[PDB]
């Protein structure tokens, strides 16, 4: 699975 940074990117998506 991807690193957690990428999950945070989705949470903050534009």
């Amino acid at each position, epitope marked *: 699975p991807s*690193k*957690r*940074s990428f999950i945070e990117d989705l*949470l903050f998506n*534009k």
Partner: antibody
Amino acid sequence: QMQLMQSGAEVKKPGASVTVSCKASGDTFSDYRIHWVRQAPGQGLEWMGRMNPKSGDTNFAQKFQGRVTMTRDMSINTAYMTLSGLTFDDTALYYCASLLIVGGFDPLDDFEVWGQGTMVTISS
Amino acid sequence: QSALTQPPSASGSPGQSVTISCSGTSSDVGGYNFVSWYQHHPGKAPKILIYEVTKRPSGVPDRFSGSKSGNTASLTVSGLQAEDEADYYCSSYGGTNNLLFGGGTKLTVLG
């Protein structure tokens, strides 16, 4: 593990700009996300925004949108926050940090890393 | 300018428990499970104790526990010790691509 080392204290005049730097070391810089959080005297913690070091993508708090930038120099593993139009309300301790808001698919990397803080004073 | 509401102070006696609250809206505390709690001693970086409402990061003892109902999150500190005197901040994802903070609750350990 990865640590964050910030630039030293500064004083700037009202209306000017200030840049705080945040150098990563100990792990791959691009694996982390850099948030900026400040605390002004007598106030609580205040989130300013976040930056993706790889892409340079950002999100800023509505309160600072229009007079803040967050940038990076990948070649030196350094993140920057520049705050402009400074007022007395911008006198504060400024931190950069890898925050833990949403956790990973496994929890091994569910930890935070904080810089030591940079004091910025706005004065003539 | 704290978006979330926390009472300014709390207290408890050693070995006992204290619960402190953090109130938001349906677009933040009540809309997502991204509530964190930070312990802040003067002069030191904040130390996260709880994330995602209930989870603890490594090294945080189980006497710190978080919960939520509706628009209200709570932190309970049991087995209170003197070293627990600090200002406790809640945070939540919220608004539009934002992280909101409460104003902090300063905890005094009595006696």
